[PDB]
Design an enzyme around this catalytic site. Structure first.
Site, PDB file in Angstrom:
ATOM      1  N   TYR A 471       1.582   6.012  -1.622  1.00 25.14           N
ATOM      2  CA  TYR A 471       1.191   4.910  -2.488  1.00 25.14           C
ATOM      3  C   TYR A 471       1.352   5.315  -3.965  1.00 25.14           C
ATOM      4  CZ  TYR A 471      -1.622   1.036  -4.268  1.00 25.14           C
ATOM      5  OH  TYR A 471      -2.072  -0.062  -4.948  1.00 25.14           O
ATOM      6  N   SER A 552       3.174  -2.752  -1.754  1.00 31.55           N
ATOM      7  CA  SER A 552       2.809  -3.094  -3.151  1.00 31.55           C
ATOM      8  C   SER A 552       3.255  -2.038  -4.202  1.00 31.55           C
ATOM      9  CB  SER A 552       1.329  -3.494  -3.253  1.00 31.55           C
ATOM     10  OG  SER A 552       1.063  -4.709  -2.559  1.00 31.55           O
ATOM     11  N   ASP A 643       3.139 -14.897  -0.768  1.00 34.15           N
ATOM     12  CA  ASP A 643       2.340 -13.843  -1.359  1.00 34.15           C
ATOM     13  C   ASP A 643       2.124 -14.165  -2.841  1.00 34.15           C
ATOM     14  OD1 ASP A 643       1.266 -11.461  -2.461  1.00 34.15           O
ATOM     15  OD2 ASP A 643       2.345 -10.238  -1.017  1.00 34.15           O
ATOM     16  N   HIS A 685      -0.186 -11.931   1.357  1.00 31.42           N
ATOM     17  CA  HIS A 685      -0.167 -10.454   1.280  1.00 31.42           C
ATOM     18  C   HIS A 685      -0.870  -9.760   2.475  1.00 31.42           C
ATOM     19  CE1 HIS A 685      -1.050  -6.568  -1.110  1.00 31.42           C
ATOM     20  NE2 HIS A 685       0.257  -6.624  -0.933  1.00 31.42           N
TER      21      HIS A 685
HETATM   22  C1  CAC Z   1       0.523  -3.487  -7.586  1.00 25.58           C
HETATM   23 AS1  CAC Z   1      -0.955  -3.273  -6.309  1.00 25.58          AS
HETATM   24  C2  CAC Z   1      -1.288  -5.000  -5.434  1.00 25.58           C
HETATM   25  O1  CAC Z   1      -0.597  -2.079  -5.095  1.00 25.58           O
HETATM   26  O2  CAC Z   1      -2.383  -2.771  -7.167  1.00 25.58           O
END
Ligand code: CAC
Ligand code: CAC
Lengths: 714, 706
Positions: A471, A552, A643, A685
């Site tokens: 991430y 994301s 989304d 999402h």
């Molecule tokens: C850009 As995001 C929805 O991973 O905080």
């Protein structure tokens, strides 16, 4: 099989001047989600996708094996109101989890709300707030295809609906006052006609109080700031019921203001207001994060990062607010992730220590340590016990541990843990696999923790498919948690999984976060690349048997990494990624992420954004001298059509750009590996039905097994 | 339908095997396939599985069917509750649980709790077969299949805390557990420690099965089989003895009040107990409905094809009186004593149910609720119960458990539970009944389900179901699969109530059995001809499906009229009519089929026996362009009910005669077997029906509609 990439119109009108640097954006038109051309683009890419996915023979075997492995009961962590316990339940393959209720611990569960009986279970519950007396259940549903929520209220005595209906909620909870008369919530203003939740950039969030038995238009306004439209809200009420707390946030930053309203001091109730409310502004700047943990009168215990990267607990009296005292001081090595007041005078602290949890029970008043339970590779989460509660529940999970809801009666049997519920996965021998932690040097020498899960006693000869997750942003800690899919990957595709705890996360406190954000966002991709290089060099896998996946900001991670190092990977799967870093702030709640990314409004920030922005860094790897045989990996860009969180234009514009630059822009490209999008219809999402999810993960791993040339094992 | 060429696997022929049926020589070259556990038979299974998987891979729509079935089936289903003491018990399923969960609750208002969840044992491969709660509601006797065979093991549970008793009772098949009112134990009917010499046993709680008291057995008649019952007052144990599959039985009554000591009275041998043998012959069927002392009300077919209720005193047994006399037009299917002095009768009237409430003592009619196209089933209310429950279902009605409070508000029906199917508009479809002339002029009722306002231009795929035997009534009931066929393949469904069934009483049964078994196939063919001639469908867009005797129906019909059908799907069919009686419980079916032991019966059996009537249709002079339809022979590898040799021997014979026996056959349509291994669970079923309809859509050239 050769692909027929569909025509996508280019618009050479669209040029934009970012501080002298000209930037062409030929797929600007794809930003309109509801056009003739954008809907035909979605249709065309769906055809292309279905054509490629039909060749992935293993999808069907994955799907059936996931369905079997997932068909076991799953239990949410229960919470108490009055003598009632409430929890989410799912028998295994129900489209949405059912909210249950029971009288005391011994009591037999009954259904309070079943989303599967409404709209065929397309939408589940987002909000679920039971009142203090346990008579009222406020609950949130997705009335449209977007994740915007409608609050509705139910009588728990007989399931009858109240007439009250509250629109325009996103992530707000419903915080009940102890009088059972109503609740605080934080909505956005209403849509004017013409506007859409996909195209509107929701600003001017409000803090409202709603009385039961009234229309939303009668709700009392407590706070809003038209001079700072981007500021957003969270709120809370103290366990004694006396203080309403309003947290104000600048963007995505782990920092907030703290405004306290004394509810005992108002003559004529919250009806007093009709003029904004007399908050005591205990913190009126964005220097540090503050989260109230408990109070005794005006004496508050907060969790904070003020002069404390790894966080700590502090105390302050609202009548003497300049004097702050450390209750539980900052640890020198480990992050204080969360703290929870429990059993009247006790305090449970969750510490993250080299990406493993340690739970401490301490005395609230003194801060003295009493017990200390370190926990295995995995996660503990979902502690919802309030101060007046004597039984504490938490969920435990790991790569090889489906999910245990544990129970600790701190009053009457304080040292034992009882299993409230243990989910058992069928046809799965956990002892055949192991999970190791390893630390790997990055490009700048920083040691990055890595979890590697695999069969015990595999030879390290580079033969195995490898799937790698990450991430890298927003202070998020990435924990090894159970995915049934992944067990099917490990067992029936002989796979190796890797969770890389790269920088940008919060795993080693705020220093870890800031080392992978703004100007230093590149470090995050470098860390991930370096971990991929370790799996190859140590012998788990090879260049083209490595698959990377993320969602994301994790999608951004995957798109960035394949632009920079296409040779290192054989499959790339980017879920709802943020791919236009120049324009992300212009759409929906994307302006919030400027704290972590920067913004192309400012020249310094543009200069680092342009360097990694996925759509602006797609380059033919074969054209680089000495890189002739390299092509981009097989790529699946996942997104939903509705989304509103990470708008799908990001995914669409990347897909268009890649398909142009690599495939359709030249006669006979070296690019053989497919570049497709899986676009899920009538989804948002998160919060999708069990089968919708299973279908998506089935396609993910089927495409992956085809890209990595991985055979099935029975 | 199917473009890619097939490679039919070699199957050895044995020309040694000739058998003399009364002078008529009959060659059986696949005799060796009767051995299920051989090198060659296992390799045959392996080869046909390869062939099957190769053909099924070309059926692109299987996956879309499977996902649409899964979605359409993922809704809660509730079984019909029954009462013991103040507890109500019912089967439940949230939608895609491998097996149904048995639930319990305190009174009607009460919240359900789980009493036994099969999904937590053996991963939910086996569900419950037996489920008997005791009179005091303290004990739950339940049957599981411990292994792949159909033999059941009775186990007993305490409902107070889910704890198991040590008691374990082996060698049960279909026997229920009938509790005495003292809560001390129960009557059940096991086979000895093949399946012959069934016994009637009483088991005391807290004992080994070897201590169980023997009530009845007949070593002089090893084929006779047993059902049993206890009267609602608890005073009489009733033992029904049956000859074979025929609707007839003896009635033996044991007075439980007259035993000094309990059932310990028969502790030592004294083999057979002192039953009052009220009926000691197989002339008619008899089922006790209620009693007042020795005055019994029975349901029977004695001089009454459509059945009736009669009364008799066990002290004056030669005098029988009609309580509710035989209807001139409608079958009395079942009768249930209810609400102390009332009597609920289920009538079948032109294949639609009619529920009548009558006074028990007099037989007078009080209310009469006719019911819509569909079925009502599962009436388990006892005499002492004042609320009656029943399950309703139809082609377009998923399942409603209705509730009738006969004491308070007797005429009104409340919905205990209504299952709602997602993504399905019922009003877009309709179901009509139509009567069609057969080959001998008999009018055969047909249900036809389809989209409202379809043009009758022969464009639509048509799926036709039927059975035709053993007194079985075929009712239009809910299948989620079928909704996917109707909606997403534009289909037309047809349930044909052919003869052999019991829909118009025992005259309907006997018109389609033994010497008249051909009438059953004629009726089904005639219904297929109607759908074509009236304009729903065409010759090669018609699909026929059936199971067991229904598999026989499908195999017989495609041999006789291959031109009429485009797809044939025969589930566990009885295909060797000369030898069916030699295997497992196949000897039971001689009542309906006859037996090749006797010459008259051989003569009608040889004419339709599926394995002995596979002929190249193109070789018949008017019939050159005709071939057999695309054929899927469904079976399990160790089905003990209808042994798989039937399906294997048919498949071998068809593949020889039509395909592998000549250079370049006109037979293009695939002839395969779907063999299920080691099997039953929700997904196993869904996978099978997914393959069925995928193969069908390929054979009938039917496109998908979103
Ligand atoms: C850009 As995001 C929805 O991973 O905080
Ligand atoms: C269903 As049958 C009596 O033909 O085995």
């Amino acid at each position: 099989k050769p692909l027929h990439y569909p025509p996508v119109r280019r618009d050479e009108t669209v040029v934009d001047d970012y501080f002298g640097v000209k930037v062409a954006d030929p797929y600007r038109w794809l930003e309109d989600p509801n056009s003739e051309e954008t809907k035909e683009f979605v249709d065309n890419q769906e055809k292309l996708a279905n054509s490629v996915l039909e060749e992935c023979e293993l999808i069907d075997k994955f799907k059936q094996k996931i369905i079997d492995f997932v068909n076991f009961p799953r239990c949410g962590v229960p919470f108490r109101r009055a003598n009632k316990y409430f929890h989410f339940y799912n028998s295994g393959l129900q489209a949405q989890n059912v909210f249950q209720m029971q009288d005391d611990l011994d009591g037999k569960p009954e259904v309070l709300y079943d989303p599967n009986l409404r709209e065929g279970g397309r939408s589940g519950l987002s909000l679920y707030s039971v009142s203090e007396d346990a008579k009222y259940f406020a609950f949130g549903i997705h009335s449209g295809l977007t994740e915007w929520v409608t609050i509705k209220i139910l009588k728990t005595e007989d399931r009858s609906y109240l007439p009250d209906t509250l629109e325009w909620v996103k992530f707000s909870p419903a915080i009940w006052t102890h009088d059972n008369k109503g609740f605080f919530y934080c909505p956005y203003p209403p849509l004017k006609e013409g506007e859409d939740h996909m195209t509107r950039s929701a600003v001017n969030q409000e803090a409202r109080y709603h009385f039961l038995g009234t229309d939303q238009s009668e709700d009392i306004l407590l706070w809003r700031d038209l001079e700072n439209p981007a500021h957003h809200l969270k709120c809370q009420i103290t366990d004694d019921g006396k203080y309403f707390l309003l947290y104000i946030l600048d963007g995505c930053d782990d920092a907030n203001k703290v405004y306290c309203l004394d509810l005992t001091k108002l003559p004529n109730g919250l009806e007093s207001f009709r003029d904004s409310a007399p908050f005591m502004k205990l913190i009126d700047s964005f220097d540090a994060s503050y989260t109230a943990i408990a109070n005794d009168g005006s004496v508050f215990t907060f969790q904070t990062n003020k002069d404390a990267p790894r966080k700590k607990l502090v105390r302050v009296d609202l009548n003497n607010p300049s004097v702050w005292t450390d209750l539980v001081p900052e640890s020198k090595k480990d992050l204080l992730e969360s703290a929870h007041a429990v059993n009247e005078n006790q305090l449970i602290l969750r510490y993250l220590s080299d990406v493993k949890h340690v739970l401490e029970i301490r005395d609230l008043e003194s801060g003295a340590l009493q017990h200390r339970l370190p926990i295995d590779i995995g996660s503990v989460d979902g502690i919802t016990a309030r101060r007046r509660d004597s039984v504490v529940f938490f969920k435990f999970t790991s790569i090889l541990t489906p999910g245990i809801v544990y129970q600790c009666d701190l009053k009457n049997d304080p040292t034992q843990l009882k299993i409230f519920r243990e989910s058992v996965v069928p046809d799965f021998d956990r002892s055949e696999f192991e999970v190791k932690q390893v630390f790997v040097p990055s490009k700048d020498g920083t040691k990055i923790p890595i979890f590697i899960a695999a069969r015990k006693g595999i030879s390290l000869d580079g033969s195995h498919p490898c799937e790698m997750h990450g991430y890298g942003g927003f202070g998020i800690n990435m924990m090894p948690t159970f995915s049934a899919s992944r067990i099917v990957f490990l067992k029936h595709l002989g796979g190796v999984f890797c969770l890389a705890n790269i920088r940008g996360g919060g795993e080693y406190g705020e220093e870890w976060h800031k080392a992978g954000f703004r100007d230093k966002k590149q470090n995050v991709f470098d860390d991930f690349i370096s971990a991929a290089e370790y799996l190859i060099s140590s012998g788990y896998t090879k260049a083209r048997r490595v698959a990377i996946e993320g969602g994301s900001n994790g999608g951004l991670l995957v798109a960035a990494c394949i632009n920079q190092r296409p040779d290192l990977f054989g499959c790339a799967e980017a879920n709802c990624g943020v791919m236009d870093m120049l324009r992300f702030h212009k759409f929906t709640l994307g302006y919030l992420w400027t704290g972590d990314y920067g913004c192309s409004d400012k020249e310094e920030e543009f200069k680092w954004l342009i360097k990694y922005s996925p759509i602006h860094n797609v380059r033919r790897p074969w054209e680089q001298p000495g890189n002739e045989e390299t092509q981009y990996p097989a790529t699946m860009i996942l997104t939903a059509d509705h989304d509103d969180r990470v708008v799908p234009l990001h995914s669409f514009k990347l897909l268009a750009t890649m398909q142009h630059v690599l495939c359709t822009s030249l006669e006979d490209s070296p690019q053989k590996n497919p570049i497709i999008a899986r676009i899920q219809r009538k989804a948002a999402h998160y919060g999708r039905a069990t089968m919708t999810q299973i279908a998506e993960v089935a396609d993910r791993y089927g495409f992956m097994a085809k890209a990595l040339e991985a055979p099935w094992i029975d």
